[PDB]
Amino acid sequence: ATPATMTSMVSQRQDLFMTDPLSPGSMFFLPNGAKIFNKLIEFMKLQQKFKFGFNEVVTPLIYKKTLWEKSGHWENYADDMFKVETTDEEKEEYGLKPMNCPGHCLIFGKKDRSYNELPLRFSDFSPLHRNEASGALSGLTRLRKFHQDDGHIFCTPSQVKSEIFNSLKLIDIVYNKIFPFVGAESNYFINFSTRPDHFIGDLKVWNHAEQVLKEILEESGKPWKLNPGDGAFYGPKLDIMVTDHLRKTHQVATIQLDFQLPERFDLKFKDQDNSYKRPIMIHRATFGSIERFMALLIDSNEGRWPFWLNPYQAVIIPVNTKNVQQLDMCTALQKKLRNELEADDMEPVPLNDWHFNVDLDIRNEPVGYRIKSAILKNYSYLIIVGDEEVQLQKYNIRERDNRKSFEKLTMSQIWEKFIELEKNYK
Amino acid sequence: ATPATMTSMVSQRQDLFMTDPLSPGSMFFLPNGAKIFNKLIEFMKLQQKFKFGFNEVVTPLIYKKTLWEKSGHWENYADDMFKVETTDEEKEEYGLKPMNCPGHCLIFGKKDRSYNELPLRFSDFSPLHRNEASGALSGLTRLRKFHQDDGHIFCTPSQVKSEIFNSLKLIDIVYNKIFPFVGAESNYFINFSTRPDHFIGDLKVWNHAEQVLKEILEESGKPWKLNPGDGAFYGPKLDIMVTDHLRKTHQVATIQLDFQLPERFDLKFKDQDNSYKRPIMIHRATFGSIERFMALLIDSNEGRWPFWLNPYQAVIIPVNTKNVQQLDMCTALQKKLRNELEADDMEPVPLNDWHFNVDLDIRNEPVGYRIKSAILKNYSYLIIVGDEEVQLQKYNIRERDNRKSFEKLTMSQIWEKFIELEKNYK
Ligand SMILES: [K+]
Ligand SMILES: [K+]
Ligand SMILES: [K+]
Ligand SMILES: [K+]
Ligand SMILES: [K+]
Ligand SMILES: [K+]
Ligand SMILES: [K+]
Numbered sequence: 001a002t003p004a005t006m007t008s009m010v011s012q013r014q015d016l017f018m019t020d021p022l023s024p025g026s027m028f029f030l031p032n033g034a035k036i037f038n039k040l041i042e043f044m045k046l047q048q049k050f051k052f053g054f055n056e057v058v059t060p061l062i063y064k065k066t067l068w069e070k071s072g073h074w075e076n077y078a079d080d081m082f083k084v085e086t087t088d089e090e091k092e093e094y095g096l097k098p099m100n101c102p103g104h105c106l107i108f109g110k111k112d113r114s115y116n117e118l119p120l121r122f123s124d125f126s127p128l129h130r131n132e133a134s135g136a137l138s139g140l141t142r143l144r145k146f147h148q149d150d151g152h153i154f155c156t157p158s159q160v161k162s163e164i165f166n167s168l169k170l171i172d173i174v175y176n177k178i179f180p181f182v183g184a185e186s187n188y189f190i191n192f193s194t195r196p197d198h199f200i201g202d203l204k205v206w207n208h209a210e211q212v213l214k215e216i217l218e219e220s221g222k223p224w225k226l227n228p229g230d231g232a233f234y235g236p237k238l239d240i241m242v243t244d245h246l247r248k249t250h251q252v253a254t255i256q257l258d259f260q261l262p263e264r265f266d267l268k269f270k271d272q273d274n275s276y277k278r279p280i281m282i283h284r285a286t287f288g289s290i291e292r293f294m295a296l297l298i299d300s301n302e303g304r305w306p307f308w309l310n311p312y313q314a315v316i317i318p319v320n321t322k323n324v325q326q327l328d329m330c331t332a333l334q335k336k337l338r339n340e341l342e343a344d345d346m347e348p349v350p351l352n353d354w355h356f357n358v359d360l361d362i363r364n365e366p367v368g369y370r371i372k373s374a375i376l377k378n379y380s381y382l383i384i385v386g387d388e389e390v391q392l393q394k395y396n397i398r399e400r401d402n403r404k405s406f407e408k409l410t411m412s413q414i415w416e417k418f419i420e421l422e423k424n425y426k
Numbered sequence: 427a428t429p430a431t432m433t434s435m436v437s438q439r440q441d442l443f444m445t446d447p448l449s450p451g452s453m454f455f456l457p458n459g460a461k462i463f464n465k466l467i468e469f470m471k472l473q474q475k476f477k478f479g480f481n482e483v484v485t486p487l488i489y490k491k492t493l494w495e496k497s498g499h500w501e502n503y504a505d506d507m508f509k510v511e512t513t514d515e516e517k518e519e520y521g522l523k524p525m526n527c528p529g530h531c532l533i534f535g536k537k538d539r540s541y542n543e544l545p546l547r548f549s550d551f552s553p554l555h556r557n558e559a560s561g562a563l564s565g566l567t568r569l570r571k572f573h574q575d576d577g578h579i580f581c582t583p584s585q586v587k588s589e590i591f592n593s594l595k596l597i598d599i600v601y602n603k604i605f606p607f608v609g610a611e612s613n614y615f616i617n618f619s620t621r622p623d624h625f626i627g628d629l630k631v632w633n634h635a636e637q638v639l640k641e642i643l644e645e646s647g648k649p650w651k652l653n654p655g656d657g658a659f660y661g662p663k664l665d666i667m668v669t670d671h672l673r674k675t676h677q678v679a680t681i682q683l684d685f686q687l688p689e690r691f692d693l694k695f696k697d698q699d700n701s702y703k704r705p706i707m708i709h710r711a712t713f714g715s716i717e718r719f720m721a722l723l724i725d726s727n728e729g730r731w732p733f734w735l736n737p738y739q740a741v742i743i744p745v746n747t748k749n750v751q752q753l754d755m756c757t758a759l760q761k762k763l764r765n766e767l768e769a770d771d772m773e774p775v776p777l778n779d780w781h782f783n784v785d786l787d788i789r790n791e792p793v794g795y796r797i798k799s800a801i802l803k804n805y806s807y808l809i810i811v812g813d814e815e816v817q818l819q820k821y822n823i824r825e826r827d828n829r830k831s832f833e834k835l836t837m838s839q840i841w842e843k844f845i846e847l848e849k850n851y852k
């Protein structure tokens with residue numbers, strides 16, 4: 001079985017995604033797929049805004065050909081770029097953005113910048129488009145449209161290493177802490193991607209940029225490999241490489257050292273001596289393609305999501321669907337955990353309340369088969385209620401991946417237990 | 427002063443937005459603008475997911491000309507549609523989506539549908555594109571690109587009125603509860619937008635759809651006006667009209683009754699008799715253009731945001747910036763309220779923690795001028811610390827819009843006070 005196949009099998013079983021040839025290379029996120037998608041974005045936004053000092057911006061999707069010419073993307077990134085011309089009488093040429101670099105340069109240039117605000121970090125969770133061949137499309141790994149935690153840092157020379165080390169820290173949080181993956185201790189190795197045949201700028205600067213990067217690479221102690229000619233046209237980069245269960249490698253994140261784009265946009269800040277100076281840019285993405293990241297999570301978990309990510313967090317199963325006592329206790333729990341409001345009052349859903357994806361299977365089917373269905377769907381928890389549970393007023397709850405043991409918990413305890421799980425990414 | 431002018435003045439004062447001719451009609455959301463933008467989206471997602479029974483989906487941005495022909499948007503919505511052709515050798519024609527109707531029909535058709543799951547509600551917070559004239563662009567009210575809480579409901583005949591009444595309920599929550607606006611008691615009136623000159627489908631169905639809508643209109647008790655010929659090509663609609671301070675009207679939300687698109691996509695569900703039947707579609711948007719909504723909030727508040735929306739929630743001002751005691755107490759508060767984590771540990775920012783936009787003005791300027799600056803920026807709270815505050819270990823805190831009174835509060839009390847404000851949209 002291939003990863004694309006595993007992704008597809010899980011998607012069909014959990015109703016995650018769908019595709020349509022009227023929009024080739026672009027995913028549809030069904031409700032369950034969107035829940036996972038949004039969960040990942042929410043998590044990443046938090047780390048970037050409240051831990052790594054990033055400020056999110058929201059940018060246009062299409063830009064006139066001119067901007068791409070000014071950045072150097074139009075030529076030096078021509079084949080990957082999704083180019084269009086409008087079909088109105090005055091056919092203007094456009095590029096759907098394949099990345100946010102130029103737009104973020106416009107933003108940097110919009111206000112007078114001072115050394116006071118460096119490093120200046122912008123994050124952007126926008127749809128990117130890249131027009132690659134039909135025969136190159138594969139599941140969620142290769143798409144024409146995908147989302148990315150695009151990000152750009154504007155800093156001074158003495159800030160470069162610190163900024164890249166903090167970049168690596170976030171990368172490690174994602175790939176070596178929060179998520180489980182199945183050679184070395186780390187779930188990735190670094191590709192040292194060097195000057196491409198077609199590069200913009202001066203060779204001695206390029207040499208300098210590659211020297212700085214390699215020094216950081218060495219100081220990090222992280223395993224790395226030389227990756228000749230795969231740098232961006234504007235600078236060399238550290239590409240984070242994750243390995244398939246079929247031992248195929250994928251770039252999932254990147255850190256790019258860019259001394260060139262600032263030149264092309266005439267970027268400048270007022271230094272600690274009132275002189276003007278070019279900021280250095282660090283391009284960065286931790287998820288890279290969020291779609292690709294999800295595909296790789298699935299390659300490892302085979303649909304067995306962590307509780308906090310799971311669109312199927314818990315199912316509640318009454319032994320006898322005709323029993324009012326069992327039903328009441330089940331319904332009571334579902335309402336508590338879902339924490340929803342009625343559409344009949346003017347009372348709004350408050351910010352930062354907890355809401356859990358828990359379902360209630362009262363289908364007229366044998367209890368054993370309702371349980372088997374829940375198992376196939378990879379519910380993180382199975383919550384069963386029989387006469388004894390009603391009597392004790394405690395729920396029988398067991399975790400999907402624990403085979404024999406189980407807990408008997410009150411409604412309040414389950415509530416707090418789930419809060420604990422999700423709050424801290426279990 | 428015009429609304430566009432007021433929006434621009436506030437934007438410049440608070441660094442909310444920016445524009446660039448390389449992307450005409452599309453906004454850039456600076457960090458402060460994005461905070462407000464994201465806050466609004468977060469609020470709306472909550473109401474829709476946990477109160478009004480909606481499931482969010484994520485869809486492609488571009489679709490082949492064919493889909494638009496199948497829906498009827500290509501012709502019957504030609505002038506508003508943003509049409510393109512790719513500039514590769516094989517020039518394929520595309521439409522950036524001006525709305526999600528067709529995509530949501532593809533989704534409905536992807537799985538076998540049963541009466542069990544009706545009404546079936548999909549919400550979609552995507553960028554929409556509409557290609558309208560340069561001389562039609564105005565601030566945030568008329569744009570080529572904008573975001574919308576697009577949404578579509580698939581229901582049965584007997585569910586139409588209930589669904590539309592709940593739609594109206596959400597609309598009232600936004601426009602007649604949560605936000606303040608400055609003729610009738612309600613901050614809007616309804617336009618009964620009837621069959622357009624160019625409509626798809628059968629006239630008797632159209633007559634029926636308009637009859638149902640009018641009946642709902644009458645039962646609602648809400649003031650409304652006849653709006654001839656302004657219905658969609660697929661159905662009549664209730665357009666929510668909000669009034670400027672310059673007495674100009676704007677559509678900010680919509681509810682559209684659609685018996686036609688289901689026909690064109692051959693949509694069907696299995697009824698309570700195992701027969702197949704066309705679902706009815708209700709198109710809906712509460713914010714409409716989120717950009718337009720923000721412009722109208724500004725038309726009323728003139729930059730004086732509610733605490734929960736404010737990018738400038740509170741500023742902390744030490745009387746003497748050279749005083750360690752004052753500084754410590756100020757810094758202690760800022761750290762508490764911001765609730766950030768260090769980039770030096772592997773400890774992740776947990777879900778659903780509180781984080782407040784509070785700044786610390788220790789600029790070497792007279793205290794009176796630092797205060798004046800905060801006032802101009804419309805900080806919701808001014809928090810001042812002098813010797814007496816250090817002595818008492820309580821902060822002097824006053825609300826922007828309260829002229830004389832103030833509170834003396836501990837760090838913990840301020841924390842909980844802000845939680846209360848934001849949690850419940852003050
Ligand atoms: K320096
Ligand atoms: K990039
Ligand atoms: K049984
Ligand atoms: K036990
Ligand atoms: K019916
Ligand atoms: K619409
Ligand atoms: K003074």
Ligand SMILES: [K+]
Binds near residue numbers: 832833834
């Ligand atoms: K007091």
Ligand SMILES: [Zn+2]
Binds near residue numbers: 284
């Ligand atoms: Zn970049």
Ligand SMILES: [Zn+2]
Binds near residue numbers: 526709710
């Ligand atoms: Zn629609």
